[PDB]
Ligand binder design. Structure first.
Ligand SMILES: c1cc(OC2CCNCC2)cc(-c2onc3ccc(-c4nn[nH]n4)cc23)c1
Length: 237
């Protein structure tokens, strides 16, 4: 992710097949002839898409030009959460499945994984960052506190941001419960709140493993439900 002053990010396409698949996903969704009600509603929950972009002198070098979801914040607190029971897709090899499950073998049980967070702390005027090893170290016993950390400014628990996050996740959940045409593997929710009142972004990102489907995305729904449940419990802290 390259953060651009104009309020966009440039995401470099991942190597094939993943990068191409994410391009086709955005292209399908934001198809200017699309009157598919499911895909039109989905746009709300994605970064705005500005199409494929390459450097003027380098058409080989493919990026997606996306809305920077953090742009309108002063001191954004950002958390990336991978959603689902499986982070491998329907066409993964045995080795690939093993690779994916071994990265975090608790994915089936919990249904989400914190990829990272950046949390602004008021009283130190500084950011605490957690990397992928943080979320991958969380278990059933520590997931509530693991998530809570995102919402601590170093004086209070931001229950406003927690409650707002539940409400925005709920709308994404409602979308998923009204579509049986896409299944999403190894995709994430990007959470943003203001670290400097109930002012939150919750957006879907990372679409290298989105596939056509005939069914409810049961794994994704499970993940959203469990995440909402964790966030709900945090409101009782
Ligand atoms: C700043 C930081 C940021 O977080 C990084 C930091 C490391 N831990 C979490 C990931 C994300 C963003 C951001 O803002 N808008 C975004 C739109 C799409 C994407 C995106 N990423 N992967 N596929 N799409 C990322 C986006 C901006």
């Amino acid at each position: 992710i390259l953060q651009h002053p104009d309020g966009t990010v440039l995401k470099q396409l991942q190597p094939p097949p993943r990068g191409p698949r994410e391009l086709e996903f955005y292209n399908m969704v934001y198809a200017a002839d699309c009157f598919d009600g499911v895909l039109l509603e989905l746009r709300k929950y994605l970064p705005k898409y500005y199409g494929i972009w390459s450097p003027p002198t380098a058409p080989n070098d493919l990026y997606l030009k996306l809305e920077d979801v953090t742009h309108k914040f002063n001191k954004p607190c950002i958390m990336d959460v991978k959603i689902g029971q499986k982070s491998y897709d329907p066409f993964a090899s045995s080795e690939k499945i093993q690779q994916q499950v071994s990265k975090y073998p608790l994915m089936e049980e919990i249904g989400f994984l914190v990829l990272g967070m950046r949390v602004y702390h008021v009283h130190s005027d500084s950011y605490e960052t957690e990397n992928q090893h943080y979320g991958r170290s969380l278990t059933k016993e520590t997931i509530k506190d693991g998530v809570s950390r995102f919402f601590h400014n170093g004086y209070c628990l931001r229950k406003d941001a927690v409650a707002a996050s539940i409400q925005k996740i709920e709308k994404i959940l409602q979308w998923f419960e009204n579509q049986k045409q896409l299944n999403f593997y190894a995709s994430s929710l990007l959470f943003v709140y203001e670290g400097s009142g109930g002012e939150v972004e919750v957006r879907m990102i990372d679409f290298a493993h989105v596939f056509p489907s005939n069914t409810i995305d049961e794994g994704y729904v499970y993940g959203l439900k469990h995440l909402i449940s964790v966030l709900r419990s945090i409101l009782d802290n």
